[PDB]
């Protein structure tokens with residue numbers, strides 16, 4: 001439970017640490033096509049998941065609902081070339097319902113995210 005609370009509500013749901021500093025003044029705007037790599041896991045340590053297992057970047061449009069709340073929030077704070085760690089309570093992820101069989105109810109998740117690039121719609 002180290003790191004900066006990047007939630008709107010300030011409920012320590014989404015905690016971030018920058019591990020490697022990006023560059024540019026610019027963070028992605030809502031609706032940018034965003035290119036990352038990521039290593040992700042449950043905090044209980046029973047499942048792991050990486051962009052690298054698909055040997056290709058992970059692509060998604062920011063704030064257009066295609067990843068969990070925490071990713072839309074977290075990635076909008078990052079600059080090109082930033083590596084960050086996010087620690088994510090279930091309210092910002094898969095909630096009490098979970099997303100079986102991958103994620104159990106009320107799972108806390110961890111990710112390491114490298115923002116590779118972003119381009120305007």
Ligand SMILES: COc1cc2cc(OC)c1OC/C=C/COC(=O)[C@@H]1CCCCN1C(=O)[C@H]2C1CCCCC1
Pocket residue numbers: 038040041042047048049066067068071099102103109
């Ligand atoms: C690429 O496959 C998945 C990866 C994760 C979760 C999934 O569904 C719950 C997955 O199945 C379909 C995709 C869901 C989109 O996933 C997400 O919003 C977040 C952020 C984008 C990367 C993927 N992701 C996930 O929660 C992973 C999950 C997998 C298990 C380790 C913890 C992280």
